[PDB]
Amino acid sequence: PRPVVLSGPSGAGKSTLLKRLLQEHSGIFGFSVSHTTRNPRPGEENGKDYYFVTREVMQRDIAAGDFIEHAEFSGNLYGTSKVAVQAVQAMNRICVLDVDLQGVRNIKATDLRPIYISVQPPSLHVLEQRLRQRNTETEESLVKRLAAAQADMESSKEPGLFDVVIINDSLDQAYAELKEALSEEIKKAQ
Amino acid sequence: HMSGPRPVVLSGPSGAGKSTLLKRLLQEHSGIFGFSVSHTTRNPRPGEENGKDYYFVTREVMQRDIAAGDFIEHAEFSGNLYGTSKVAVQAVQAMNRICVLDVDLQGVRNIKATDLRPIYISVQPPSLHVLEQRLRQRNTETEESLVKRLAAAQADMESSKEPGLFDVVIINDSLDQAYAELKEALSEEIKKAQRT
Numbered sequence: 353p354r355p356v357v358l359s360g361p362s363g364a365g366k367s368t369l370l371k372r373l374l375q376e377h378s379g380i381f382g383f384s385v386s387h388t389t390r391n392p393r394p395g396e397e398n399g400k401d402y403y404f405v406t407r408e409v410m411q412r413d414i415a416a417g418d419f420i421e422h423a424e425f426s427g428n429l430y431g432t433s434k435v436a437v438q439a440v441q442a443m444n445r446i447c448v449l450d451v452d453l454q455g456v457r458n459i460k461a462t463d464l465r466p467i468y469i470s471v472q473p474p475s476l477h478v479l480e481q482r483l484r485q486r487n488t489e490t491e492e493s494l495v496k497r498l499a500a501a502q503a504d505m506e507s508s509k510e511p512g513l514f515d516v517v518i519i520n521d522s523l524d525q526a527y528a529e530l531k532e533a534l535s536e537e538i539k540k541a542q
Numbered sequence: 543h544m545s546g547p548r549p550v551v552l553s554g555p556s557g558a559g560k561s562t563l564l565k566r567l568l569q570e571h572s573g574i575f576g577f578s579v580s581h582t583t584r585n586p587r588p589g590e591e592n593g594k595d596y597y598f599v600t601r602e603v604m605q606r607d608i609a610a611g612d613f614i615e616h617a618e619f620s621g622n623l624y625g626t627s628k629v630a631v632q633a634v635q636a637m638n639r640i641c642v643l644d645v646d647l648q649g650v651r652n653i654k655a656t657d658l659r660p661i662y663i664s665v666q667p668p669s670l671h672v673l674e675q676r677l678r679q680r681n682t683e684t685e686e687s688l689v690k691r692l693a694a695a696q697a698d699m700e701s702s703k704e705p706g707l708f709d710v711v712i713i714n715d716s717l718d719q720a721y722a723e724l725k726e727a728l729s730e731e732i733k734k735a736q737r738t
């Protein structure tokens with residue numbers, strides 16, 4: 353199955369849509385479990401949301417060549433390990449990736465050959481309004497995420513970068529566009 | 543040189559407690575040990591979670607995986623396939639954890655011919671009758687499956703005496719007794735993993 357790379361600004365809803373996509377389509381999709389050095393959030397599960405490792409363990413895995421790609425966000429390391437993608441491929445499931453723009457760039461040079469989907473908010477201020485109204489992290493983490501969102505949004509205008517660009521006006525609308533873009537591949541796996 | 547921490551292979555009959563023993567070891571020593579998630583073609587039971595207890599796949603998928611070289615070992619047990627994939631072991635090693643595996647007798651013999659070099663521990667029930675009672679009391683098994691598991695279980699206990707096969711044999715009379723024996727047998731293993 354062709355992998356699916358979900359990107360876009362952090363907080364724009366790509367993870368909410370991803371979770372709904374996997375829950376609605378049992379047996380079809382598998383989530384790529386990235387490594388990260390950031391602290392886990394309450395409710396996040398090691399080996400399910402991320403492989404939560406120390407910086408020392410992350411650098412050792414990097415040096416061993418464990419990662420298809422790795423990146424930095426807010427002073428922490430993230431990466432897609434070969435094992436995380438191979439684990440889904442060994443299930444014959446559609447592997448779904450959730451990475452930032454730099455991950456998209458590096459994945460372009462690999463043999464994965466996925467479909468690239470960007471999940472964009474309607475505007476930078478609407479994204480901040482949604483994240484501030486949530487009020488789930490400090491001003492430092494929020495602003496660091498919003499600063500990264502500015503760069504992620506401007507690059508969605510690059511021709512050929514993303515196969516599909518979804519603007520999250522509402523989560524139901526954005527999910528309907530996600531299912532349409534993957535309709536042929538879902539039908540194939542089904 | 544003195545060996546460092548090695549993978550841990552637990553074998554013995556299902557229903558004799560090796561899985562519940564392993565879950566206690568994993569939840570109480572998660573800073574040291576990680577679980578190898580085997581593939582199986584048998585159907586999931588209630589309470590089992592794909593990617594945690596097993597990778598539940600079809601035979602067609604598992605055989606294609608085998609042909610692709612994905613597996614360290616694989617075996618046929620009671621009509622279904624089970625196997626330890628390379629990525630299962632590597633995922634635990636990428637976590638800076640020591641891999642613990644739960645396999646049948648064929649898997650023990652399979653792993654002996656690999657470069658894993660684990661410690662081999664056999665978890666035995668008090669008797670075949672107590673095992674037959676525990677198995678049928680847990681249900682989730684056809685009569686044909688229960689019979690095949692009982693016949694495989696007698697081979698388990700007989701193999702526990704084969705010289706040089708297992709490093710440790712634990713008779714699981716009670717879980718607390720069997721767990722304390724498991725930690726004692728893994729005392730040097732835990733020390734080595736914590737010092738690295």
Ligand SMILES: Nc1nc2c(ncn2[C@@H]2O[C@H](COP(=O)(O)O)[C@@H](O)[C@H]2O)c(=O)[nH]1
Nearest residue numbers: 362386423425430431432450451452454455
């Ligand atoms: N390049 C790359 N980015 C990732 C990876 N995992 C998560 N990210 C991205 O890192 C950002 C921070 O993720 P969060 O910390 O909010 O989970 C998000 O944009 C997310 O998509 C990864 O494995 N590789």
Ligand SMILES: Nc1nc2c(ncn2[C@@H]2O[C@H](COP(=O)(O)O)[C@@H](O)[C@H]2O)c(=O)[nH]1
Nearest residue numbers: 556580617619624625626644645646648649
């Ligand atoms: N050889 C081998 N045996 C396994 C593997 N995974 C589970 N088994 C064994 O297969 C038997 C049946 O497992 P159950 O169906 O009771 O979960 C048990 O003895 C179990 O330990 C594996 O990956 N390889």
